Design a binder for this molecule. Structure first.
Ligand SMILES: O=C([O-])/C=C(\CC(=O)[O-])C(=O)[O-]
Ligand code: SF4
Length: 753
């Protein structure tokens, strides 16, 4: 067919739209109905299109992704599991991005130099493991994973998996890009079929066009408020309608990115002329030309069925700001000043932060510079502190060149390194004390308790970068940029003009400094060294195989009340230092979860000593004494980040099962991957029948089967017992992971030894 390479770094890896077409056509002959766009790309990547059972929301699809991307806070454990498999080389194009371990303190170059000294052991491990197993390496300073992917790797029709829940960002260039845990990435790098529960499809029809202060970010802030954080679970969100051509390609990536906050499997836009334009401006005109020839397979079929349809008229959409502790609490910017006042949320904004993968594009930076130049023209600078994170080295070099970085410095901003930084709590924040109630506003995406600065009382609101800039200049939530007046230096009141800026550079992008390191695919004689006394890295010891017995008289480690995110189960911020060291990071296990017994975080009753203490310590005490334990959770357990450490840590400290009213998708898969039993109540009211003092027996593991519930005997201390049923979503592939002790143990059994 055409021999068009998948990226500039892999000249020999060709795009296979011929394969996609062939597979779409086998499947539509079977289904005889219109296919949505997500169905075309997902069913087009089936391992066996002729025999795969395809029912939305019910069957597990065996898929073949085109490539794997990893960022350095999850790559360490994905590669330590890959190193246990014993396989010599990755089977598909794979990259590591070093973006999560650079702490914001001094700004830009200074923080990057310091991170390279501090994290030398880890950057060394990842570069060497990358060279040995054939994984491309983007050096510290290169940029945030998802901006590097949109710029270099995402193309229409790709199926890409990434070990980061915001990998959906690539849906802005028409690909299916899905967040997974490190063990799922190992399947694909190992060459075995990846499984995904067949998604439902929510369609969002966009009408009208964006005007003025409304930006692409307001579309997904509104959609999150509508669907809530659990409304997208098990579905792909597919944007369509006449309003789509109104949105820039990075704008589409912003909307797909934050669909992670409603729990969606991913989000996608149809191939169109804005994407074509972006591909051509990023050196990939040949890929846009090939996608023009396969265009029919890159847009939805006429008359396809969505399981839910939502319509948003872009012309009536107004600026939004969401939070403070969930991203689906949505307020128009016009009313947040008055809701804050009523709810006792701090009105004064201490810090305004723009960037992150969600909103660090050239257009985002130009729109923020457009607000800032107006303030400068009246002799004002920011009242709040103001930070700017460029998404990649190319964007930093180009906004520097086109003058936007200097405008942002002149209003009072500090340009941080091209890294997550304050977004995952890598921020040496010193302006407030811990426990001090305060407000920050960001153009990020999640705003969960203590995530940006480890202070549980920081109230963080997420909005668009131009609204963060406008509010940073005013310094208060009681300021609506559309209606209110500022007072210049000269004494005149003035109003901010709605920002307008170019979506892409008129000239070409300036690539900035060299940061990609290609694997030697010759040599590969790298020894990966992990010192046995390292505090940051530790080789894995395999978990135990199942003993063949039912789980009786399980102790409840903690019955959690309410929202329990993976930042509650395994915090980030300072704990990122231990992401390659399982025993050391297990000391944060569940320290953020609220215990229903006393309403406290990190205080559970040790059943033997009758002392209340830290959750990690209690779990290690139970494990020392052979007491097997369980966690009882509420709705949407495991919401958020994909970090598989929230599943590896309970397995390591002797946990056996997590029984909840419902699970978020990626955490439930990670639990099964590590040999734990994620189970849900067949009747969610049974959560109220279990008290922290009860012992539980899970029976029926011997005839464990897809679709058959397990019986749980609740043993009350007074001698009463109650039997309840627990459902599970295991298929026979997954039951084999459980019986072997973990998916990696099963994979190693299949290696004939
Ligand atoms: O490295 C991580 O902890 C996983 C992240 C970053 C985050 O929480 O934003 C994710 O999957 O989203
Ligand atoms: S959401 Fe924040 S922490 Fe996660 S990849 Fe994006 S910039 Fe990094």
């Amino acid at each position: 067919r055409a021999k068009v390479a998948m990226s500039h770094f892999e000249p020999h890896e060709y795009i296979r739209y011929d394969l996609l077409e062939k597979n779409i056509d086998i499947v539509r002959k079977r289904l005889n109905r219109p296919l949505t766009l997500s169905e075309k790309i997902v069913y087009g990547h089936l391992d066996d299109p002729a025999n795969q059972e395809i029912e939305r929301g019910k069957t597990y699809l065996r898929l073949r992704p085109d490539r794997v991307a990893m960022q350095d806070a999850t790559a360490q454990m994905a590669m330590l599991q890959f190193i246990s498999s014993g396989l010599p080389k990755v089977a598909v194009p794979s990259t590591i991005h070093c973006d999560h371990l650079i702490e914001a303190q001094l700004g830009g170059e200074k923080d990057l130099r310091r991170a390279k000294d501090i994290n030398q052991e880890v950057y060394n491990f990842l570069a060497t493991a990358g060279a040995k197993y054939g994984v491309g390496f983007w050096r510290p300073g290169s940029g945030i994973i998802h901006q590097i992917i949109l710029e270099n790797y995402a193309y229409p029709g790709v199926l890409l998996i990434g070990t980061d829940s915001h990998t959906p960002n690539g849906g802005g260039l028409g690909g299916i890009c899905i967040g997974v845990g490190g063990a799922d990435a190992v399947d694909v790098m190992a060459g075995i079929p990846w499984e995904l529960k067949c998604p439902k499809v929510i369609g969002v029809k966009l009408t009208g066009s964006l005007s003025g202060w409304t930006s692409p970010k307001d579309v997904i802030l509104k959609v999150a408020g509508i669907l809530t954080v659990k409304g997208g679970t098990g579905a792909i969100v597919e944007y369509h309608g006449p309003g789509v051509d109104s949105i820039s390609c990075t704008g589409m990536a912003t909307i797909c990115n934050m669909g992670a906050e409603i729990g969606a499997t991913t989000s996608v836009f149809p191939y169109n002329h804005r994407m074509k334009k972006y591909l051509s401006k990023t050196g990939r005109a040949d890929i846009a030309n090939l996608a023009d020839e396969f265009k029919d397979h890159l847009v939805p079929d006429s008359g396809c069925h969505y399981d839910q349809l939502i319509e948003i008229n872009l012309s009536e959409l107004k600026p939004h700001i969401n939070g403070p502790f969930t991203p689906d609490l949505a307020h128009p910017v016009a009313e947040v000043g008055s809701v804050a006042e009523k709810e006792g949320w701090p009105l004064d904004i201490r810090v305004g932060l723009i960037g992150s993968c969600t909103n660090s594009s050239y257009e985002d930076m130009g729109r923020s510079a457009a607000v800032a130049k107006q303030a400068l023209a009246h002799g004002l600078k920011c009242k709040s502190q103001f930070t700017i994170t460029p998404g990649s080295e190319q964007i930093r070099a180009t906004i520097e060149r086109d003058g936007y970085a200097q405008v942002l410095r002149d209003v009072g901003g500090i340009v941080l390194a091209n890294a997550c930084g304050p977004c995952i709590g890598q921020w040496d924040r010193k302006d407030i004390k811990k426990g001090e109630k305060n407000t920050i506003v960001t153009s990020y995406n999640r705003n969960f308790t203590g995530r940006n600065d480890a202070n549980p009382e920081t109230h963080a609101f997420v909005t668009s970068p131009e609204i963060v800039t406008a509010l940073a200049i005013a310094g208060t939530l009681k300021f609506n940029p559309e209606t209110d007046f500022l007072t210049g230096k000269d004494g005149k009141k003035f109003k901010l003009e709605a920002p307008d800026a170019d979506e892409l550079p008129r000239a070409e992008f300036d690539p900035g400094q060299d940061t990609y390191q290609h694997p030697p695919k010759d040599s590969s004689g790298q020894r990966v060294d992990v010192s046995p006394t390292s505090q940051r890295l530790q080789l894995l010891e395999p978990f135990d195989k199942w003993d063949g017995k039912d789980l009786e008289d399980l102790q409840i480690l903690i019955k959690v009340k309410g929202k329990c995110t993976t930042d509650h189960i395994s915090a980030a911020g300072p704990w990122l230092k231990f992401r390659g060291h399982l025993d050391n990071i297990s000391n944060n296990l569940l320290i953020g979860a609220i215990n229903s017994e006393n309403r406290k975080a990190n205080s559970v009753r040790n059943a033997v000593t009758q002392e209340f203490g830290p959750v990690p310590d209690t779990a290690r005490y139970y494990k020392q004494h052979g007491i097997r334990w369980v966690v009882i959770g509420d709705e949407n357990y495991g919401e958020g980040s994909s970090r598989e450490h929230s599943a590896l840590e309970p397995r390591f400290l002797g946990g056996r099962a997590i029984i909840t009213k419902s699970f978020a998708r990626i955490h439930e898969t990670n639990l099964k991957k590590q040999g734990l039993l994620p189970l849900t109540f067949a009747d969610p009211a049974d959560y109220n029948k279990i008290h922290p003092v009860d012992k539980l027996t899970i029976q029926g593991l011997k005839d464990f089967a897809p679709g058959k519930p397990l019986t749980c005997i609740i043993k009350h201390p007074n001698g009463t017992q109650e039997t309840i049923l627990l459902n599970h979503t295991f298929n026979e592939t997954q039951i084999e992971w459980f019986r072997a002790g973990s998916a990696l143990n099963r994979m190693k059994e299949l290696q004939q030894k």
